[PDB]
């Protein structure tokens, strides 16, 4: 019981980190995907692993 509970807390906290970093990426890069003429500054593209 204790190991299953703690390992579920481990997986949930890992998933929360993943969702928070994915949300930060989405919040940062989406304006450059919406704006018609724009392209990301290449340093930020390397940092955020931009798809280009």
């Amino acid at each position: 019981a204790a190991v299953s509970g703690a390992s579920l807390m481990a997986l949930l906290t890992l998933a929360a980190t993943c969702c928070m970093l994915a949300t930060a990426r989405r919040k940062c890069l989406t304006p450059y995907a919406l704006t018609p003429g724009a392209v990301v500054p290449l340093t930020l593209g390397l940092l955020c692993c931009a798809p280009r």
């Binding site: 989406t30 304006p31 450059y32 995907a33 919406l34 704006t35 018609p36 003429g37 724009a38």
Partner: protein, 158 residues
């Protein structure tokens, strides 16, 4: 007067339950559609796309097909103080506030471009507020680098 020549092929209509709900416009290499405009594009070439929508800018964009870039409208970041062109009437720009004669705005109708005096899309209208005789628009304007959604108090999404 002349900008309707460009609007007639920048615009595609968005249709739901067999009726129009609003528009999408080809701006640069991206199609701009408001997110409140529900339904699907009447053109399969745009309906097949996946749109990187955002709730902050009430906007959905996708990279338009290889061919359709032929007819997409030229944009500009230039927003000089002055006179601007639109389907139902002439827009006036004032310190950031695009404004229109009241009643020229209509339900749906969102997603039309506004054109500058050179025929370039300056921004995409989303709605407007009951600013007396001269409604002020909640159009989503863009800077050199970033979309900067504008919205006056008392907007309705007409």
């Amino acid at each position: 007067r002349m900008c309707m020549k460009i609007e007639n092929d920048c615009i595609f209509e968005v249709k739901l339950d067999g009726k129009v709900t609003g528009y999408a416009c080809l701006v640069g290499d991206k199609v701009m559609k408001p997110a409140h405009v529900k339904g699907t594009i009447d053109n399969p070439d745009l309906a097949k796309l996946t749109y990187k929508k955002s709730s902050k800018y009430d906007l959905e964009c996708a990279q338009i097909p290889v061919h359709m870039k032929s007819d997409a409208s030229k944009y500009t970041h230039e927003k000089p103080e002055g006179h601007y062109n639109w389907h139902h009437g002439a827009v006036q720009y004032s310190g950031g506030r695009f404004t229109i004669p009241t009643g020229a705005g209509k339900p749906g109708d969102s997603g039309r471009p506004i054109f500058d005096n050179k025929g370039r899309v300056v921004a995409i209208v989303l709605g407007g507020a009951n600013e007396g005789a001269r409604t002020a628009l909640s159009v989503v304007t863009w800077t050199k680098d970033m979309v900067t959604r504008v919205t006056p108090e008392g907007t309705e999404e007409w």
